[PDB]
From a paper:
The TMD is composed of a voltage sensor-like S1-S4 domain (VSLD), a pore domain (S5, the turret, the pore helix (PH), the selectivity filter (SF), the pore loop (PL), and S6), and the amphipathic TRP helix.
For the three classes of [name]-[name] at 4 °C, we assigned class I, class II, and class III according to the size of the pore opening (class I being the narrowest). Based on this criterion, the 4 °C class I represents a nonconducting, closed state whereas class III represents a conducting, open state. Comparing the [name]-bound closed state of [name] (TRPV1C,[name]) with the published apo [name] structure shows that [name] binding induces slight local changes near the vanilloid binding site of the S1-S4 domain (S3, S4b, the S4-S5 linker), but otherwise the conformation remains similar to the apo [name] structure. Because the backbone carbonyl groups of G643 in the SF can coordinate dehydrated Na+, as evidenced by the cryo-EM density maps of the TRPV1C,[name] and the published apo [name], the only residue that can potentially block ion permeation at the SF is M644. In the closed state T641 (PH) and Y584 (S5) interact with each other, but they do not interact with Y666 (S6) which is concomitant with the first S6 dilation. 1 Initially, [name] binds with no significant conformational changes.
Author numbering:
A (entry chain D): 114 to 139, 152 to 183, 188 to 223, 229 to 238, 243 to 602, 624 to 763
B (entry chain A): 291 to 579
C (entry chain A): 725 to 763
Write the structure that this text describes.
Amino acid sequence: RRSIFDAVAQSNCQELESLLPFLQRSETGKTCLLKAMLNLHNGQNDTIALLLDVARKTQFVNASYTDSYYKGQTALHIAIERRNMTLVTLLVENAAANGDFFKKPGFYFGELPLSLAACTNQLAIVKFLLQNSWQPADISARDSVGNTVLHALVEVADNTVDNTKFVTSMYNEILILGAKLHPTLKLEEITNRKGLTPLALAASSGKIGVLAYILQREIHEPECRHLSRKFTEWAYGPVHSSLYDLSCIDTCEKNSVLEVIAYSSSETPNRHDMLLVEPLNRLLQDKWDRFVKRIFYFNFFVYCLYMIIFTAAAYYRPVEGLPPYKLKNTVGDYFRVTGEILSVSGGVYFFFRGIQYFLQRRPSLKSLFVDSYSEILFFVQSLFMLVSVVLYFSQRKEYVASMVFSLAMGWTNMLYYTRGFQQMGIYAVMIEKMILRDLCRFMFVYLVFLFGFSTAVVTLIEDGGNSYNSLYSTCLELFKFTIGMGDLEFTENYDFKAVFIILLLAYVILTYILLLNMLIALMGETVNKIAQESKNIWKLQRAITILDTEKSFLKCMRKAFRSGKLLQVGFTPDGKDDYRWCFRVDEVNWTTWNTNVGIINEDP
Amino acid sequence: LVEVADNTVDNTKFVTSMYNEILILGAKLHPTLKLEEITNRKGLTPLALAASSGKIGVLAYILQREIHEPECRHLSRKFTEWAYGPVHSSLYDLSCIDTCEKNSVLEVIAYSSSETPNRHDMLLVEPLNRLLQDKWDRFVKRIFYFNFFVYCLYMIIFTAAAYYRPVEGLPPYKLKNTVGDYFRVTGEILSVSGGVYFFFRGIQYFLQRRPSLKSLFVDSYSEILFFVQSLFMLVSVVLYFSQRKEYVASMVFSLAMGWTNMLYYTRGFQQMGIYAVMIEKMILRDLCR
Amino acid sequence: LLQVGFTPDGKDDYRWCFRVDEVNWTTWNTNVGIINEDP
Ligand SMILES: C=C(C)[C@]12C[C@@H](C)[C@@]34O[C@](Cc5ccccc5)(O[C@@H]1[C@@H]3C=C(COC(=O)Cc1ccc(O)c(OC)c1)C[C@]1(O)C(=O)C(C)=C[C@@H]41)O2
Ligand SMILES: C=C(C)[C@]12C[C@@H](C)[C@@]34O[C@](Cc5ccccc5)(O[C@@H]1[C@@H]3C=C(COC(=O)Cc1ccc(O)c(OC)c1)C[C@]1(O)C(=O)C(C)=C[C@@H]41)O2
């Protein structure tokens, strides 16, 4: 064994030739062929052919490494990786890499020779394997996870421009070849174990390039034209109207692309930019303009009424006695009690809606305050209302201490409804983001400074006065300096006036002049950085609003409000009458001058 | 060759190319001799000299250089452990980047007196940033957080003991059998011990580094502030045991400084470390004018 | 501590290395000198 391995590594067949007659007369698992293939330089491994001939003259071709790390690897995989067309053909003429190296430091390409060839830019080897006379590869085969070659191609994509160009081109080539070989089979419809298709997988994983390619792709070849999603309804001059498939973009049995993009947990790289693709933005705008805007405005109006009733009923709360408060025959009492009942009902409604959302989505802690700010705020207001009810019926007077907070939250939650308008939706987005990010840092630093100087000042004071020798009072008096209401001499119970005035001046210069102006500068810089990002965040928020409204209204009319019209785009390869729910859009282009064919309809 | 380099793009290309050529020829003629190991009178090697003088181009060339020629391959620092497809894992030498007998590159870059042109950008080279992040994640983060926690405890004890200072009489204040007096005296002892500790640490730093006056407030802001707080504490002690009531006039200042020194510990976090950096720089530059 | 090759006179060039991975689509595998046979 050692001598054979040494001869194979040395690329010398003299020792192997001498030992062959002797053999005839007489943890890893690597075979002689695998070792020869691995230890090959510039195709200098010549012992492979002799070893294969000897093995045939004496099952060895399929020998594979048995190690869990490299389980399943064979000579064909090594040849394919090495980019040896001749060696690959020779090995094929005369499996799945399940090893941990090839599972989801490692490289994932699927677990089939066809997938490995497809993911590596060896198109010729893909073609040869697909139409190899000795043995053709199975285009529809799936690995352990269930990914096909198309799933593997989607997984490989990393949004790099060259990588995107590759993955899209190879996807198109494999699609066309698969259609040519097996017209009946629908390759894209296949799903992996998780249940996602290549399009759904691309939308879920954030691969914007693959999604953009798939959504709007046209194959002009008459041989394979049904493998397209964007057609051309007609064209007269520089004007032409086209269609988009919208097959599983609007409503799909498993999961549509819109809801996969919108309901992503923000771990997806670029959810915000994934809705700018050609069909999706226009589809969302169509849904907004058609039937969602009126429902949104009605919801806003009803919330306004609820808040007005809540404010009126809380303003006129009974003040004399202890809760609960017995009813009175006066009409005012009846109206007040009606207001309280309506407020409590609204609180319960929001409580249940928040619980429903948190169960359905199961957000993680990190993304809880980054993707569900509005839901958290509404749920917290409902929680305050319910605590207020519990205290009120427990003969406690602290219920008001809860109620007011809820009431305050109520009004400040009206900003949620500013997402129906672009220019105010962006303003609310910036308010949210600044509150989340900047104020935490600013307040940590501010409180460090304030507490340090308040402790120093109250230590200096001796109260011997107005009992200013209190930490709370000194903290409040030093905080007043920040809001332009600070008295420089608010006490005289100190033995040393110079120390007191020096401390106050230092605090004023360090916080009022330095920290606050620095915060102004940082807010200005942040406004510039996120001028465009806020627009994308607002668009995502409105898209989620549209999806929620449509899902809620599905009960009233599940399929009545469907986007796009059913149209015939051509004939199927086997039958005819290729009917699909298309979404027409027009376009005008002076430069190119009408040079194309395939206009579905004769007359514009 | 290192001395000649002036960080110009053409100059850098020259100096690196000639360095490589001379290295290869020297290896061919005299394989046994290790040319780079030689040092000048000051004791620096070409790599250490490049790191010290701020020559970022020469440092970047030296740190990550591979000579594929089989004749002279050991004259390389960045290898290639393996490669399967578009994925490959490589290695870096780290010979005298982490620990060196004379002076490692990391400590030469970090402990430079800011006269070096571009200390700040010299840590972005391929091995150094990842090496520092590895050290942070592995064993330094926990010690930093423990130090922050202990400083928080010290500051809380100091604040509590200074808040309840005796007000009637003249120092020193005789002890009382009450438990509150025992706790207060324990707080004072702990505060004084912390002040002495920071005093000695500041003296140690200033002796080891010997900063110049110009760079004193540009490279050792935190050290100066901690030393000044310790100085205030010691002056407070001296006045307190001299039967003077002005010790409080010192103590409070120290106390104030104490809390505002917590910002030193915001460098364990990027987004607040940058904020503290800007506070420092603005205080130094803009407010004077 | 890892072995990176053989010294010009002796052998077993051992040094304290710091491994890092890299991924690159564009260039397509064209080099030699991989220290280890198997990834
Ligand atoms: C859950 C969180 C973060 C939060 C809950 C409450 C207590 C809140 O204080 C904060 C912390 C705070 C405290 C003081 C000033 C700023 C922030 O911020 C919000 C939270 C911050 C707001 C600011 O107003 C808004 O953000 C409205 C709003 C903006 C964007 C939205 O998409 C939105 O949809 C619901 C609502 C107002 C309060 O909710 C309010 O009215 C009360 C009494 C305190 C504010 O805690
Ligand atoms: C050595 C110097 C420059 C200094 C020492 C003290 C007296 C200081 O005033 C200054 C001058 C001054 C006075 C008033 C306003 C701004 C600046 O600035 C600092 C110095 C300025 C600060 C500002 O807070 C900080 O800078 C905290 C800090 C930031 C960055 C750090 O890396 C850091 O590490 C220790 C600490 C607070 C004081 O130290 C403080 O608490 C007291 C009572 C006065 C401030 O002199």
